[PDB]
Every structure is written in structure tokens, then in C-alpha cells.
Design a protein around this ligand. Sequence first.
Ligand SMILES: O=C(O)c1n[nH]c2c1C[C@H]1C[C@@H]21
Lengths: 56, 233, 337, 216, 294
Amino acid sequence: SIAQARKLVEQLKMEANIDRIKVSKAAADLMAYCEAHAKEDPLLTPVPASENPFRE
Amino acid sequence: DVQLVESGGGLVQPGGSRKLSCSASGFAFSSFGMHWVRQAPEKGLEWVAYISSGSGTIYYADTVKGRFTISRDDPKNTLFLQMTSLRSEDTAMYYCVRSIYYYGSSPFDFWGQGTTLTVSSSDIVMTQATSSVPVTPGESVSISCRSSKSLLHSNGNTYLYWFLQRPGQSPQLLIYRMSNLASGVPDRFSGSGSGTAFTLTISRLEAEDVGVYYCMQHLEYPLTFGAGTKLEL
Amino acid sequence: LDQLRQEAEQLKNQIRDARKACADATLSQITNNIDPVGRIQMRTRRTLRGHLAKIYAMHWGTDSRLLVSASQDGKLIIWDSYTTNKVHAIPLRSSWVMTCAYAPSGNYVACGGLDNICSIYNLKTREGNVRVSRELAGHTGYLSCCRFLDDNQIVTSSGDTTCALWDIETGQQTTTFTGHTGDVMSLSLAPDTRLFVSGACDASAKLWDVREGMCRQTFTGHESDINAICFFPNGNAFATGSDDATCRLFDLRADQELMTYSHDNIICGITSVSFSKSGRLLLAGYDDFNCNVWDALKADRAGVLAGHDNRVSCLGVTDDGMAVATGSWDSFLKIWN
Amino acid sequence: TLSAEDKAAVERSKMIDRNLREDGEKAAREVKLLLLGAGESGKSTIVKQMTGIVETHFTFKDLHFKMFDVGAQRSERKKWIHCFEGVTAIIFCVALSDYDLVNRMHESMKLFDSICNNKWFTDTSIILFLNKKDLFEEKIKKSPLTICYPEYAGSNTYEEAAAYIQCQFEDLNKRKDTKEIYTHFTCSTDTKNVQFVFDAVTDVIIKNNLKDCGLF
Amino acid sequence: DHFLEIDKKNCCVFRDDFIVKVLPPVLGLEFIFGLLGNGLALWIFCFHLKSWKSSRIFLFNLAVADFLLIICLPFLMDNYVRRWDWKFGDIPCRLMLFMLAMNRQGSIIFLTVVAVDRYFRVVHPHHALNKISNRTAAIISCLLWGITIGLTVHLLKKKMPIQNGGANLCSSFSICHTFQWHEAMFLLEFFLPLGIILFCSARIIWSLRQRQMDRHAKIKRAITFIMVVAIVFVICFLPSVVVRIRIFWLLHTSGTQNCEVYRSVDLAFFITLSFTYMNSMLDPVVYYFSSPSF
Ligand SMILES: O=C(O)c1n[nH]c2c1C[C@H]1C[C@@H]21
């Protein structure tokens, strides 16, 4: 049969009928998360060897 | 299930050479370091000997060093304690504690039933202060213990263990490394404390909790127990 | 037979038109005012030196100290990364393993590969040895990834173009996720575990709902098979690493590609991707025998993790973000800080 | 500086390392063979003398062999074919009777070309097995080889046809320097296939040993 | 005339020309060439070779033995420039003699070990010896170094400086009668390793020919290199030992007391002994650089 085409059409309409957020504000959201949590990212800012568990 | 049966007790003339056996059945005995812990007829627990998995490391207490010999025989899961020159100070009940050592493990989790042997006629002092306090069901009691040396290590874990010996049976592990609760222990038991000062709190205490509580140090050998705090009523 | 194809074409046209309409500014021109992170200096703090064959997978524990690694000598090894101690060494029934997982509770690990079976291993047994808890069978292709949801739920991706959600208690497939036309090679669970993304060999990544099961969104843009996928720490974006020597950042809410992490010198596929704790760094493992770290907002190489003599096959970042671990086809894992 | 528990954990790790070394030494003494074919080519018939992957173990002259039949792995071959990079040799089985129709030997040569000229199997020798020689004789007695091979200047005799088919499979090797193809016109016969595999594996192991000491 | 007492009877040592006329250049060329080769090989093995297989361990041990044997050359060169007038003293001369003997013996031992390793890899391909661990190779190398040191340290516990007239003799191989270990070991280290190497090479050639692998460029190159290794060993170590055999023959046959005929044979002995050092420089180009992996 051709039920695969019907299933593809159902999936495509399900995927098309969603709410889309502007790319600029979502990029701003990613920037906001990164700048908010940059302080607790030891890979970004090299943590001192005093409390680095892998100091050796 | 996990079982440890002790055999080889009886009455021994002084200077004898009786041997003690402990057969393990229910766990991977080859990967468990084993201990012998004796208990005098009315005194508290006293560590005797230790043999690691693979028999690569053996330790003895200064009281039995040179006279006792501990050895595993892995293929059929038996632990032996060859003792020679038995004196009246060796009259005790001997336990066959098992202890496995890796990151996050709980050593001393299972204790054998114990066999009684009668002989005819720089260590850390682990102080438990009080010896017997009266309690009532539904209350809260904090059992205190002190150490002569700081049990806190550079790794960040304080090596202090809490055991409960209910009347008529072997001790059972309650808390290992002074914070973690052993598997099977109810969450009512809680361990806390800093270096040279440790406490064990039994919130909402009730029956099947009376007995002696021993605080034990595992910082380095010889392993030393407290005097033991009795709970009655 | 033909009207269905025409209708599908109209839906693709509508989807692409909506995506273009919502594309008003790329984040390249939005984040250009930020100062770059600069050069990233990481050094091999530890070298786990126990395996004897190719290492295909590794997973950090939630405690950020224990990690499990799977290699082709049929051995699962659990490492104490702080001291390089071997906590456990689990002999696998099948030597061909391509995936490895660590339960968030730490009580279990999972393994799978060319045997089409996901095996659950119990770490905390009263017997003191690691025993197989359950063998999950039902996949008709090789197991490519597996991620624990909790002690009883695990989601696996297979080469039979399907992802499955299992119930480890009963061993049955609670849900089946069938929308891929190629082998699913990667899997990444959302931080809230309400969703997960899968990257397949049809150059497409799909967003699934675990609770009932349906592809919510489909993301395209890659030119070859997607080998790696990872969720942004926010949970609203993810990165894909594919065989066309590029990494792309996709956005769930915008339903679009955000950035492409590519360079002319790099011409090899990507085997593994992961984000840093804050998501500012994107670390990708390549076939050049080395791992690149990218500025996730700037799309430039912030550093290089070159310490392996073969292809970097697996890579992960601890929960606290303190270190990254890379496994290679040489039988060594390295912890970088 | 380590505590007592740290020392005991280090001892356990050392024991684990020793066990890993012993198992690795035991595994390195085994010969890993990858068994490839086109299904009806005779892989099962080759196996008979001794849902995912299949492993077969057998011993010959104090040498342990592990044969991995990928078989029912209906996925992308290039996704998991690098897993076997490092097998001692590849056993490729083709059926000489597969020139009838359904061209089937053309698919066999396509698979042989893909496997032989693979970046992973650059230096792994291929032991080629040409099964069903009696069926080949019976088919040649009536049908010619021209149907499957458009150009062929040779009589409808088993010897010439079989030699031409062997040559036509062998020229597909592009890296003729770094890899050798061993061909055996196998059948039911006796335990000659195992002996041929042992001889080819001994040759491959001698080459590997010469590589290890660096005079090959 | 030429008699002198080396802590024993009837030592006839002598210092004539044709020594510092042909020995200076034939040692300087060896020094430069072998120093460059050994430095390159050691650098490649240390900062470029991450594989480190047992055969590579044995080849590295041979490399360090050759390097030591050749960095001991300049002291011998300074001696030979001044005929036999040593000036470095007691400890330097004795150390140089011990290092020369021990390192020549060690290079021969590791040559033999490499030959036996190749023999086991070709003639018994499925053997546990072909898959020994790196630790086992380290133990074997240390034990072999222990052996050579063990029967060469006798050169270290003996007051060496010989005041022949107005000259210091830094010589370990002289002409006195006594069959000291420095002569029996010198002859054995050519004879017995020669037998082992010839047996190993012949068996390798016969096995590779019988298995019809000669139809291969790489196998033919390996065959040629094995034959050339055996040939180089014999060429470098045969002349000195045969002249030593003639030394013993004349010593205990005709010229036991009077030694008016040993001049030419002693000269030839030292010219041929220079070939033992030449082997040290020839070893890299025949073992490491000629390898297909270089
Ligand atoms: O090559 C040796 O081992 C050795 N021993 N003694 C002496 C040599 C070289 C010649 C100066 C004198």
C-alpha cells in the first residue's frame, strides 16, 4: 500500500503546526544563559589549583 | 544469601595451637578482604588480624603478632586463623568480618556468627565516655564518641564506623565513614561529627534498637574500637 | 500515490517558508559585540591506562568522579578519575560494544553494540560482584547509544532506524520512536528528561517526546551522517556533529539552524560533541586524532585537545564542568582541565 | 600518604590490572577471522566444519580461531565495519553457481570490491573461498559462462572457467602490494578448508611478526 | 728489547709506527659516522617511537650498547695518536677498557638476541616467545646487561696503568701466555654467537623459501637484510679473533720465550680489532635506518 505517504503527510502537518519564536530573541536567550552561568564554568575560566580536584 | 559460619571453638589448655575456620557462602569471597575481630566474655570488640583480597597484605594486632597466623584459601571460600601459644587473655568470641575496599564501598558490612574459644587457667584511643544510658521508645538519643587523633584525612572523608551489637548476635554496620548510612539500615539512624568528635543520633528510637554501639576507627592499622555504649529499657 | 507526494511537498514548502520568515538575524551578527573567550589551555591531568583495544564509548557519573568506559576487548571498566583507580572491570558477553551509559543514581551501567542487545549491569550487589541485571532485546540493528532516564527507564538508539524507550523491570519496549530513514547513531536526553534528540544517518536530527512518543520537530542542514548529538545546558538548543566535517547548533524554539562550526583545515568527521557547564564552549572529537573546542557563540576554535594517537571516539564533560574526558581508538582515556 | 582504605583500593585496582593483563594476553593468542559473503554463498556450509553478530570458535593444531559472521546485520556497513579493523584475515565466500540469474556473482564481485578496497582493510589479507564447484561443473556442462560475463574467450570447461572466475575476482584488488588474496576451490571434500585457512593465517602471522621486528 | 712484565710472565708489548698512521683516520671516521647514526637512532626511539615492542626494546638496547662503545672511542683515539702514551690516569683508562669490552660483548649479545627473536618470529610464528610483554623484554634486557657486566668487571678490579718505559700502556689485549678470561671470552663472543646467528639465519631463509613467500619484494628485502646482517657480523668479528688464534698458536708453539717475530702479527691484530669498533657504526645502517619503518 501507500500508507507511508499518508504517515509522512500526517507527520509533516504535525511539524508545521507549531509556534515559531523569532531567531533573534532565541539567540539573545542563549547569550543570556551563557553570560549568566559563565561564572561557574571552570573550563572557561581556569580554576586555581587549590580547589582543582585534578591538580596533579 | 551472604553467610559466614565460624567453626573451631572449644576449651584450650594454655600454650595450645587451636586453629579457627570461617567458611563463606553467598558472595564473591575472592574479592573481599577479611578480618578477625574478637570479643572478650564481657569486654568490647578488639580487632585481631586482616588479610586482603589476593592475600597481598596482612596485618596483625600487637597483642597477637608473632603468635597468630591468618590465611585465606579462595577455591572453596574458607578463612583460617592459626593461633599458637594461647594465653588466658585470648579467651573471646571471634568474628569473621568481610570488608571490600573501593571508592564508595562499605567495609565491615557483614559479620559472622562467631565461635567461642576458652583458654583455661601509638594507636588511636577511641573514647566513648558514657557506657550505658537509659532510653524510652519514641525518643531521640545521641551517642557520643571521641578520638585521640583526627580521623579526617586529606581525601576529605573521616574514617569512623558505627556498629550495633544487639543482644545475642553479631555486630552490624550502621554508618561507615561517619556520614553514610549502611544498606538496610533505617533512615532514622544518622551520623555526624568533626575530627576527634563524633556523634550518632537515633531519631524516633524504639524496640529492636537496644544493645551496645561501638565507634570504630579505620584511619590506619591497628583498627581500634570504642568501649561501647549500652542502650537498655 | 501522487496527491500525497504533492501535499508533502507543500508541507515542506510551508515549513521552509515559515523558518525563513522567522529568520530575521543570525546570531553571528548578534554576538559579534562580545569579547571572544580567547585561547583555551587544557592539559592532560590524568591518563587512564587499562584498556587494551579501541575505546568506543565513555560516560561520566553524576558525581563527576566516576566514569565508565567501553572498549572492544569486551571489558567495561569503571574508573576513579581522581586517583586513576579501577573500581570495577566488567567482562562483557559480546566484545562488540559501541555505546555505554552510567545511571544517574550510580547503581547501574548499560552497554550494547553489534549484538543488538542493551545489557544492564547492577553495580551495588550484596555479593560484591557486578552482575547483569537484564538484557534488553528487541532491536533489529546494532545499538549505537543508550541513556538512562532513571533506575528503571532507559532510552536506546539503534541502527535499525528506530529509537526505543525501555522498562528495565519488565524488559519490554514502552515506546518506539520510528521516523528516521537511516541508522540512528546518537542520542541526547534533555536536562528535564521530558524530551530527547536523535541524530541518524539520513543527515537529520529529530526531537521526540518520551512521554507518549512522536517526532515533534525535524532538523536538517547536515550533508552527511550525524554521528554525535548533545543538548545545550539550557535545554532549548542542541549541537550535532556529522561526517561532513562540521558541527551545527540547532534551536528548538526557533526550529532552525543557528550556527555552523566548520573550518577549511578540518575535513574529517566528528565522532563526539559536548558542551561546557555554561554552554559557552563546544567540544568536538574528530578523526584528526584530536578534539577541538569551539566558542559556541562565536564559532571559532578556542583551543585544541591534542593528546591522542588515534581517532577520538568518545568525549564527555563532568556534571560540575570541572573536567572533560576523551577516549580514543588507542586504548587510553585522558582527563583534561 | 594514602589512608588504609586508599591503600586497599589501590591494591584492588592492581589486582584488576593483573586480571586485565592476563585476559588480554589470552585474547592476543587467538586468530580473529571475519566471515563475509552474500548469504547463499555458502557461509553456513563453510562454518559447518570445525539476531546480531555470530561468533564461532574452533581449534586447529593448538591454535584457537574466532570466526565472526556479520550476516544478518542489515545496517550501513560503513558504520560498523571499522570495528573489525585488526582481524587476522577476512574469509570471503562466493558460490561458483551464482552466475545463473538474479548477475548474483556480479553482486558478489561488488561486495568483494567494496571489502577488499576498504580503508580499514588496507593490509588484512583475504582468504577467498569459491564454494559449489560441483554445481559449477554441472551448470557449465549445459549453460555457458558468457551469460554472466559478457566477454569470455574460453571453452565451456570447468578448469578454464574456474580459473577465469578466480582471476576476475583477484584483479579487483587495487592494493596488490600490501595485501594478498588466497583462493581455495572448496567443496564438501575433507578437512582441507581448515588446513588452507591455517596455512593462510600462518602466512599472515609471519608477515605481522616481521612487521613487529621491523624488517618486512 | 720488547719484553715487559704485565703482572705475569712473558708479555711482549711494543709501540711502532703504522699504528698512528692508519688508526687515527679509521677511528675518526667511525667515531663521526657512528655518533651521528646512534644519536639519530636514539632520538627516534626516545621522542618518536611510541610503539615499543619487545623487538624494539632489544634493538634499543643494541643501540645504547653501540652508543656507549663509540663514545668510549675518543679516549682510545687520544691514546693511539701518541702511540701507546696514555695520560688520563688509572680510573679513566681502566673505565675505558671495561666499557669497551663490556659494550662490545653487549652489542654482540643483543645482536644474537635479535637474531633469535627473528628466528622465533619466522620459524615458530605461533609461539609464546613472539608475544612476550614489554615488562618481560625489560627483564631480559636487564638480565643480559647483568651477564655482560658480570663477566666483564674483571677489567675493573685491577691496577691498570702499565709504566712501559716512559709510557703508560692502556692495553687489555697484550701477548702474555696466560689464558685469562679476557681471551676466552673474546674468542667465545665470536664463536658461539656466530653459531647461533648462522643457525637462525639459515633456518629463517629455509623456512621462508619452503613456504614460497620469496615471491615478494618485502620478503626478498628481509632475506637480503638477514644475510647482510650475518655477513657484516662475520666480517667485523672474524679477523681480530683469527689473529688472536695465531697469537696463541705462536705463543704456545714456537715463541714462548723469545718474541722477535710478533711485531707484524700484533700490528695486524690491532688493525683488525678496529673492525670491532667499525661494527658499532655499521649497526645502525644495517638494523634501524634500513628498516622499512624508517
Ligand atoms: O677494545 C678493547 O676492548 C681493548 N682492550 N685493550 C685495548 C683495547 C683497544 C686497544 C688499546 C687497547
